[PDB]
mmCIF file with all atom_site columns, C-alpha atoms in Angstrom:
data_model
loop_
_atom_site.group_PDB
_atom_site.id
_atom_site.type_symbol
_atom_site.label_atom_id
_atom_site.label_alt_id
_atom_site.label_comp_id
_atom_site.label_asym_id
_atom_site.label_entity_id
_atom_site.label_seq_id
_atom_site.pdbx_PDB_ins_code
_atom_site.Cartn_x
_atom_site.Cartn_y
_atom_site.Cartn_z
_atom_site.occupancy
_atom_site.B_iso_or_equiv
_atom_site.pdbx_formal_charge
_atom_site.auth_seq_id
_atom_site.auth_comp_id
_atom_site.auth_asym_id
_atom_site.auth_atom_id
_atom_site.pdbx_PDB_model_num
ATOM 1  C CA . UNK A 1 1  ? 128.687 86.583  207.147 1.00 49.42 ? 1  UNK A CA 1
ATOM 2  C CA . UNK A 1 2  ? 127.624 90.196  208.394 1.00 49.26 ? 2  UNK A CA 1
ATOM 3  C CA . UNK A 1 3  ? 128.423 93.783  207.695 1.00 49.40 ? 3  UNK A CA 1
ATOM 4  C CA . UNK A 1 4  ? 127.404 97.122  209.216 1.00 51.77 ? 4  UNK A CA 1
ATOM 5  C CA . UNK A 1 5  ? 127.984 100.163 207.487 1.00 50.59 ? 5  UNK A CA 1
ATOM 6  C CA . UNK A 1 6  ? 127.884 102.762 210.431 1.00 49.84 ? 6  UNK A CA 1
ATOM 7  C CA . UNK A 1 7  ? 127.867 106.463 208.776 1.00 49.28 ? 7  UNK A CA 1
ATOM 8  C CA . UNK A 1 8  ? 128.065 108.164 212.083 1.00 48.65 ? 8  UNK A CA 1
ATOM 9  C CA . UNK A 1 9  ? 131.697 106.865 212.345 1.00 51.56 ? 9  UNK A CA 1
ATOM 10 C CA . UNK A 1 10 ? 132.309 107.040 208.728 1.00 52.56 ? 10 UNK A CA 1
ATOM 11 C CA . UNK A 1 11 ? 134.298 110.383 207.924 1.00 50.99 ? 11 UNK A CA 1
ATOM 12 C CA . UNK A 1 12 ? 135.152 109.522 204.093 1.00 51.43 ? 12 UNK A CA 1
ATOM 13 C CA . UNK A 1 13 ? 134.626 107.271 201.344 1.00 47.79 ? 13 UNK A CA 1
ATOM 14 C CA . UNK A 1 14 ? 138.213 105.497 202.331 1.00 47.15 ? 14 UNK A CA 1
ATOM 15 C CA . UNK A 1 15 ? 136.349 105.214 206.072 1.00 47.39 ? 15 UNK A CA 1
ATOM 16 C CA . UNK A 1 16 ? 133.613 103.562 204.219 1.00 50.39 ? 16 UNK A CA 1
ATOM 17 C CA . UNK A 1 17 ? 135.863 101.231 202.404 1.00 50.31 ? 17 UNK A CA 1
ATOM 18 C CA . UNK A 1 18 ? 137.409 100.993 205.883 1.00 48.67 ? 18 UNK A CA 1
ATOM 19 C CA . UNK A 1 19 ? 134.532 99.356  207.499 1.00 51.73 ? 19 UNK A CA 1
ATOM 20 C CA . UNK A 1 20 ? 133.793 97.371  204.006 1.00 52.19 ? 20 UNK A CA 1
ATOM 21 C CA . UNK A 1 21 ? 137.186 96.413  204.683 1.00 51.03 ? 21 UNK A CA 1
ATOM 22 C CA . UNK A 1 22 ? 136.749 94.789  208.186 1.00 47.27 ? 22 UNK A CA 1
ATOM 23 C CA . UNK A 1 23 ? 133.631 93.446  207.565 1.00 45.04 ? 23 UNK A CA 1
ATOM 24 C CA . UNK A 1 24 ? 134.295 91.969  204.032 1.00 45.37 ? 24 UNK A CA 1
ATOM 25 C CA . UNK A 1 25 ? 137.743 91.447  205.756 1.00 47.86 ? 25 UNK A CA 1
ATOM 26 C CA . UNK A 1 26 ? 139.085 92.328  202.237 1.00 51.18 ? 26 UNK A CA 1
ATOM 27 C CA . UNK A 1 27 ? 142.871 91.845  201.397 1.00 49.29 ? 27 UNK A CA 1
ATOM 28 C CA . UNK A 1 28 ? 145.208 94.798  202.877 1.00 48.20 ? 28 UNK A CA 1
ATOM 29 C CA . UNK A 1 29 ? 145.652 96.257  198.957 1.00 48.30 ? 29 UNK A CA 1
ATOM 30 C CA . UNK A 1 30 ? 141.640 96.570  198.998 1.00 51.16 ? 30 UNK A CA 1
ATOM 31 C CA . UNK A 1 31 ? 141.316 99.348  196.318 1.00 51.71 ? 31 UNK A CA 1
ATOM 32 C CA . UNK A 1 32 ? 138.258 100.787 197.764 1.00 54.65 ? 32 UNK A CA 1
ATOM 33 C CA . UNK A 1 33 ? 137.085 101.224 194.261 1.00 58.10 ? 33 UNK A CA 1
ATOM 34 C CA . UNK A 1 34 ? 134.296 99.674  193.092 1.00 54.96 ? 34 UNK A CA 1
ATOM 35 C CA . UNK A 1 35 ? 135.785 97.737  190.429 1.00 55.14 ? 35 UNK A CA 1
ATOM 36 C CA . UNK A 1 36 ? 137.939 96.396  193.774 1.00 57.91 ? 36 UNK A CA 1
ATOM 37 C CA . UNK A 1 37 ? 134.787 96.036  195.859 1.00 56.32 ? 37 UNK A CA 1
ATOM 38 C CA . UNK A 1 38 ? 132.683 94.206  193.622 1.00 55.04 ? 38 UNK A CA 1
ATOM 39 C CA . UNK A 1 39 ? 136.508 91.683  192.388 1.00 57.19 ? 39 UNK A CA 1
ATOM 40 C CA . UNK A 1 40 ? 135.744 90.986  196.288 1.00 61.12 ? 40 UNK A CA 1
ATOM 41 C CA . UNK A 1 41 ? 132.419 89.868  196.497 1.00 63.99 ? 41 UNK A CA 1
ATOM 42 C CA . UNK A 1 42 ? 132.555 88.590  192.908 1.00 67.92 ? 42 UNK A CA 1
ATOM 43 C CA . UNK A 1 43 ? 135.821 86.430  193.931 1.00 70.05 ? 43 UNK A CA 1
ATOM 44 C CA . UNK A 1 44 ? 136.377 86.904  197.602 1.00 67.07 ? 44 UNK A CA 1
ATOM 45 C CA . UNK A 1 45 ? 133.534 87.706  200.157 1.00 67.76 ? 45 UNK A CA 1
ATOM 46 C CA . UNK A 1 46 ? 132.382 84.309  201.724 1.00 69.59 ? 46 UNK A CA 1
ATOM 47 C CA . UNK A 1 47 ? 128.363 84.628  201.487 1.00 67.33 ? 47 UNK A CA 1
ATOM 48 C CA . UNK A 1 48 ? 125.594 84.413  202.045 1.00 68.57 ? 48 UNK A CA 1
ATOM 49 C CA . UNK A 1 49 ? 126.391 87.603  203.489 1.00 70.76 ? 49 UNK A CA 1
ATOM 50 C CA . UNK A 1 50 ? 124.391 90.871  205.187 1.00 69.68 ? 50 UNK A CA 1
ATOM 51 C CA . UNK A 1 51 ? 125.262 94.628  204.562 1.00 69.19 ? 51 UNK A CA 1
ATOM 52 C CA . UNK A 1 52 ? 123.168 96.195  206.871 1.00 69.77 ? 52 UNK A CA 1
ATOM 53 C CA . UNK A 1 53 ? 123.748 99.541  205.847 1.00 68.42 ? 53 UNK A CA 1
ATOM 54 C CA . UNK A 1 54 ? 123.049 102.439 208.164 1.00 68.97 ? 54 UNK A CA 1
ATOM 55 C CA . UNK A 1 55 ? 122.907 106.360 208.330 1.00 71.55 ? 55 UNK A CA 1
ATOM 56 C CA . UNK A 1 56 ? 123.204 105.248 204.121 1.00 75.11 ? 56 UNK A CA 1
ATOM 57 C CA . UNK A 1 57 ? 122.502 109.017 202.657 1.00 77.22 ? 57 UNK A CA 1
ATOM 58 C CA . UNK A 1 58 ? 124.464 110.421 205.427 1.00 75.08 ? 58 UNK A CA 1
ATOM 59 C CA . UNK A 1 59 ? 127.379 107.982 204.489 1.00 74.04 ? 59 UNK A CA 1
ATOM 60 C CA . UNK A 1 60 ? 126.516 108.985 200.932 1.00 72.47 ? 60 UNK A CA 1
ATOM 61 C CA . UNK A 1 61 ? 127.342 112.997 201.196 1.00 70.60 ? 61 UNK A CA 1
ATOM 62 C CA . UNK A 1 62 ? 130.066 113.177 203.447 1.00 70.70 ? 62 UNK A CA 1
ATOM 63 C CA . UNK A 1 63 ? 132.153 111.456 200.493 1.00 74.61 ? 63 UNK A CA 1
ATOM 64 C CA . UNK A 1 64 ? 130.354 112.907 197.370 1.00 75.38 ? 64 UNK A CA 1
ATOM 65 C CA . UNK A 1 65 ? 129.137 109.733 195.298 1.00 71.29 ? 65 UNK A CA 1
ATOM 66 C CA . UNK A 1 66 ? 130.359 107.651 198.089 1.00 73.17 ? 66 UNK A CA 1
ATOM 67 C CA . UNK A 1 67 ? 128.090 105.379 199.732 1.00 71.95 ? 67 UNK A CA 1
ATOM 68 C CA . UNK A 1 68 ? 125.691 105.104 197.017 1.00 71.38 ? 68 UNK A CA 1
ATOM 69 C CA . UNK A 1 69 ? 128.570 103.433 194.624 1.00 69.57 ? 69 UNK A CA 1
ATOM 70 C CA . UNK A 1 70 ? 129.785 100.404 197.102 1.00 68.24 ? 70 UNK A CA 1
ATOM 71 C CA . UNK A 1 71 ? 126.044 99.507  197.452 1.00 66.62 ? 71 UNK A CA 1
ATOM 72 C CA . UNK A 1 72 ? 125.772 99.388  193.691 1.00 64.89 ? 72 UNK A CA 1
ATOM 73 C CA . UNK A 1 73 ? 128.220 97.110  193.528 1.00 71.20 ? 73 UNK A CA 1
ATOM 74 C CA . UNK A 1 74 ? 126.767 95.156  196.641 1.00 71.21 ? 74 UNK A CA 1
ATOM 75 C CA . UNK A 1 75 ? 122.930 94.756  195.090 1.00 67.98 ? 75 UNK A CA 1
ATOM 76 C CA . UNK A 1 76 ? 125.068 94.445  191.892 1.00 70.52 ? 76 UNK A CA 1
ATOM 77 C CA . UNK A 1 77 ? 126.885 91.231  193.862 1.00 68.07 ? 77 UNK A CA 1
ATOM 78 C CA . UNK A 1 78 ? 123.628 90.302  194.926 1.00 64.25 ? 78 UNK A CA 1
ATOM 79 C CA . UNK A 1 79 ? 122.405 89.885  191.473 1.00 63.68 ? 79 UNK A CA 1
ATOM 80 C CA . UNK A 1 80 ? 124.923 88.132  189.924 1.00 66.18 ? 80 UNK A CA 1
ATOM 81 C CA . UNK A 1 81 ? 123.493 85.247  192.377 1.00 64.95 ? 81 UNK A CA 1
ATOM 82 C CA . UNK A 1 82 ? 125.281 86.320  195.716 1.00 63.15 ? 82 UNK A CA 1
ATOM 83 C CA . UNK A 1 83 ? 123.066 86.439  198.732 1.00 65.41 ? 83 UNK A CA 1
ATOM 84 C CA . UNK A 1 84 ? 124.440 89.769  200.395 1.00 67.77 ? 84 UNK A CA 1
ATOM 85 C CA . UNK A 1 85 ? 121.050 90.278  201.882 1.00 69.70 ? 85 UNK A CA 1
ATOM 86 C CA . UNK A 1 86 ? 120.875 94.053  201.816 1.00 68.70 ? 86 UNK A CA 1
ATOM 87 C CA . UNK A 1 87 ? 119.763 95.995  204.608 1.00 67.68 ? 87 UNK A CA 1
ATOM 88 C CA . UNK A 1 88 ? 119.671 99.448  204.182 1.00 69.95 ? 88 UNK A CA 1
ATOM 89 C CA . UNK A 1 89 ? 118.395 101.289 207.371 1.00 71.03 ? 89 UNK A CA 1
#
């Protein structure tokens, strides 16, 4: 599947989980964490899936730490044999 990670809209890390959230179409409890991010696409996400990421550093300081977590955990994903093709724009 596909997700877009539009930082112009995004106004907080929960906004980022927010979109993660549609996209990923997580569960409505989705922690947001990353430990809850990553139990998704570890057990969850259907893939092979895209994150096109964009505006990342500017969805990165608006929420302190913010951005550049989830796409740990997304590349992380993507290494433990997931194909979230990661596109960060």
């Amino acid at each position: 599947k596909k997700a877009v990670i539009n930082g112009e809209q995004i106004r907080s890390i929960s906004d980022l989980h927010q979109t993660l959230k549609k996209e990923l179409a997580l569960p409505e409890y989705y922690g947001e964490n990353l430990d809850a991010l990553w139990d998704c696409l570890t057990g969850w996400v259907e893939y092979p899936l895209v994150l096109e990421w964009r505006q990342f550093e500017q969805s990165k300081q608006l929420t302190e730490n913010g951005a550049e977590s989830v796409l740990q955990v997304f590349r992380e994903a993507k290494a433990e044999g997931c194909d979230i093709t990661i596109i960060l724009s």
